[PDB]
Amino acid sequence: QCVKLNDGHFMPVLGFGTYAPPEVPRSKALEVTKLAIEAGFRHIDSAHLYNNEEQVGLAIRSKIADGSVKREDIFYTSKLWSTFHRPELVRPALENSLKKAQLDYVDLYLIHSPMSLKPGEELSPTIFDIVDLCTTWEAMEKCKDAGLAKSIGVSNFNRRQLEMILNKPGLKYKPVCNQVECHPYFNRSKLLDFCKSKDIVLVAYSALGSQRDKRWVDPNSPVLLEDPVLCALAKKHKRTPALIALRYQLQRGVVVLAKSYNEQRIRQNVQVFEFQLTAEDMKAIDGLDRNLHYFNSDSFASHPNYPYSD
Ligand SMILES: NC(=O)c1ccc[n+]([C@@H]2O[C@H](COP(=O)([O-])OP(=O)(O)OC[C@H]3O[C@@H](n4cnc5c(N)ncnc54)[C@H](OP(=O)(O)O)[C@@H]3O)[C@@H](O)[C@H]2O)c1
Ligand SMILES: Cc1cccc(Nc2ccccc2C(=O)O)c1C
């Protein structure tokens, strides 16, 4: 239940999303990540941005300590925040994430976003920065060579941003993945074909339609999990709309994340491996595509490097 990455490492095809908004107590992250591992998740997705790396790292170390899993059975991802794009800041930012989680290495480190922000400890300084992401990428390469990250990749990059890295003079390591918003309303078919042509894995976030956080998501936007085609497919397969949306991705060759802080829904989500969709089903889902990205905020849209500009 793994995909082989372009550097020889393996990535579990279903990942646990760990972001929760700051009104959720930090202690929840520890509890739900343990539940995710007990359920059968082996891919755990975190980031400096999420302010949960201590808890998530502790959940992983607990499950190693109690004997359920070994470190090498867990694929752990963190991400370089956008205030740390300057090359000399990359490795220290990774080392801080590692110290927070109390781990020797991350399976995957990503550039969280191509939209550089003014350097500082403040996450949302209130202001943009201009940085050659090719130099950021060089510093990511050195973190791989150092054994700080097994694999390195990008997140929120469009085709052109991804091409910039791929065409870089003296490239040593291709991004193994690009983790992007991806679900039946914004299925990224063209970007997905581009990544397949390069042996780069596309990892889908907001695959269940996002947490609909009012800071970036319009509450008027359609609720993906109430979609009538999804609901009709869930009735046909006697599963749930969430399960259909996750299975859709696996059948497209997409690595899919699923966040849930709910005990029942965490266990429910690993049922994605227990059924499959037919071609007529996949076509019905493909027909939902309507260029809708839930994250739709002035914070992003006015950035010189906004990925949805193309
Ligand atoms: N690279 C980036 O910039 C980026 C951006 C967004 C997300 N991500 C990563 O991707 C992860 C997932 O994306 P996301 O946070 O946008 O959320 P998501 O996976 O789209 O989930 C949205 C909501 O779906 C609900 N849910 C989960 N399972 C369900 C089920 N079986 N039935 C009904 N509802 C279900 C969850 O609510 P409950 O908790 O109540 O179950 C969750 O809040 C994030 O946690 C983060 O790790 C990365
Ligand atoms: C478009 C963009 C740019 C930088 C970071 C993110 N990611 C997040 C933004 C707010 C809250 C959570 C996340 C996430 O990474 O889960 C996105 C969606």
Alpha-carbon span 11 to 29, nearest angstrom: 22
Compute the C-alpha angle 33/273/30, nearest 5°: 0
Q: Strand pairing partners for 45?
A: 17, 77
Q: Is 1-310 assigned to CATH 3.20.20.100?
A: yes
Tell how far the Cα of 226 is from the centroid of ligand 2, in angstroms: 23
Q: Which amino acid is at 49?
A: L
Alpha-carbon span 176 to 5, nearest angstrom: 6
Q: Are 279 and 286 in contact (CB under 8 A)?
A: no
Alpha-carbon span 131 to 143, nearest angstrom: 19
Measured in residues, the chain has a length of: 310
- Delimit the domains of the chain by residue range: 1-310
Alpha-carbon span 26 to 151, nearest angstrom: 27
265 is in an annotated binding site: yes
Compute the C-alpha angle 39/42/44, nearest 5°: 105
Task: Name all contacts of 30-33 with Cβ < 8 Å and 24+ positions apart.
Answer: 30/55, 30/56, 30/58, 30/59, 30/62, 31/59, 32/260, 32/261, 32/263, 32/266, 33/59, 33/60
260 is in an annotated binding site: yes
How many other β-carbons are positioned within 10 Å of the β-carbon of residue 145?
Answer: 11
Tell how far the Cα of 116 is from the centroid of ligand 2, in angstroms: 13
Residue with tokens 């539940």: 35
Q: Are 108 and 143 in contact (CB under 8 A)?
A: no
Q: What are phi and psi of 179, to 5 degrees?
A: -100, 120
**How far apart are the two ends of the chain, measured CA to CA in Å?**
33
Which H or E run includes 94? helix 87-101
Alpha-carbon span 191 to 298, nearest angstrom: 23
Q: Strand pairing partners for 183?
A: 186
What is the 3-state secondary structure of 26-86? Answer: CHHHHHHHHHHHHHCCCEEECCHHHCCHHHHHHHHHHHHHCCCCCHHHCEEEEEECHHHCC
Tokens of 279: 């071609």
Alpha-carbon span 173 to 7, nearest angstrom: 8
Q: What is the DSSP letter of 275?
A: -
205 is in an annotated binding site: yes
Pocket test for ligand 2, best of 113, 123, 303 (most atoms within 8 A of CB): 113
Kindly report the protein residue whose alpha carbon is nearest to atom 10 of ligand 2: 216
Question: How is 255-303 classified by DSSP, letter by letter?
Answer: EEEEE---HHHHHHHGGGGG----HHHHHHHHTT-----S---HHHHTS
Report the number of secondary-structure helices (H) and strands (E) in the chain: 11, 10
Asked if 185 is an active-site residue, the reply is: no
- Resolution (angstroms) equals 2.0
Tell how far the Cα of 209 is from the centroid of ligand 2, in angstroms: 14
